[PDB]
Every structure is written in structure tokens, then in C-alpha cells.
Amino acid sequence: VKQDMPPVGGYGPIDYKRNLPRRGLSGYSMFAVGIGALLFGYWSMMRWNRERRRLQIEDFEARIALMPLL
Amino acid sequence: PGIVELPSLEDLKVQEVKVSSSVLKAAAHHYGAQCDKPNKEFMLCRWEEKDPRRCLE
Numbered sequence: 735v736k737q738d739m740p741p742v743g744g745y746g747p748i749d750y751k752r753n754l755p756r757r758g759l760s761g762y763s764m765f766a767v768g769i770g771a772l773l774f775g776y777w778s779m780m781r782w783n784r785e786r787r788r789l790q791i792e793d794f795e796a797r798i799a800l801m802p803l804l
Numbered sequence: 805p806g807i808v809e810l811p812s813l814e815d816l817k818v819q820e821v822k823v824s825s826s827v828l829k830a831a832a833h834h835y836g837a838q839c840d841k842p843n844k845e846f847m848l849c850r851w852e853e854k855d856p857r858r859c860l861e
Contacts, residue, residue, distance in 0.1 A: 799836025802843035
């Protein structure tokens with residue numbers, strides 16, 4: 735006879751339990767990365783703001799030199 | 805009440821530095837360096853006189 739039957743060795747194991755990976759860095763790592771990015775941005779903004787102040791002083795002194803003719 | 809005493813238009817008729825803003829800005833530092841004495845004289849007499857009818861020379 736022929737009928738719907740599982741095979742001679744049966745069917746294989748089937749996973750039925752939860753599997754969460756558990757991934758990412760430790761919280762100290764992202765805190766250190768954020769703090770380092772903050773410090774780098776602070777340093778770059780400091781340098782560029784000082785340069786901008788120097789350029790503004792230069793432009794203002796050019797204006798002061800140009801004033802009497804106007 | 806009072807009367808105003810305005811200067812004649814002949815005294816104000818003087819040739820001008822007919823240039824632009826960028827030309828004045830390009831040579832601004834050297835103009836302020838070389839020509840400090842008449843500019844400072846004019847600024848001082850304008851500040852202490854406060855009257856443009858006496859501040860023309």
C-alpha cells in the first residue's frame with residue numbers, strides 16, 4: 735500500500751526555543767566614543783572660532799581704516 | 805527763531821575718489837597705514853567741533 739507516512743528514520747530536529755543573539759558594545763564603550771567625539775568637536779570648534787575672531791578683527795580694522803574718506 | 809548758515813556750493817565742489825567698495829577694501833590696510841595723519845586730523849577736528857560747516861578743509 736501507499737499512504738502519507740513519515741520516512742524510515744523520521745523527521746529531523748526542529749528548533750522551538752527562543753534564540754536572541756545579544757550583541758553590540760558594552761555601555762562603557764559607547765560612552766567613551768561619545769565623550770571622545772565631544773572632545774574632538776570641542777577642540778575643532780575652539781580652533782576655528784579663534785581663527786574666525788582673528789578674521790573679524792582684521793575686517794573691523796580695515797573698516798576703521800576706511801572710515802574717514804566715507 | 806534762529807537762522808542757518810549753509811556753505812556755498814562752490815566750496816563743496818571738489819573732485820572725488822570715484823572707486824568702488826571692493827577697491828577701497830583691497831587697499832584699506834595700506835591706506836590706513838600710509839595716510840594716517842590727515843585722516844586722524846579730520847577725525848579729531850570733526851569729533852571736537854561737531855559741525856560739518858566748519859569741517860571742510
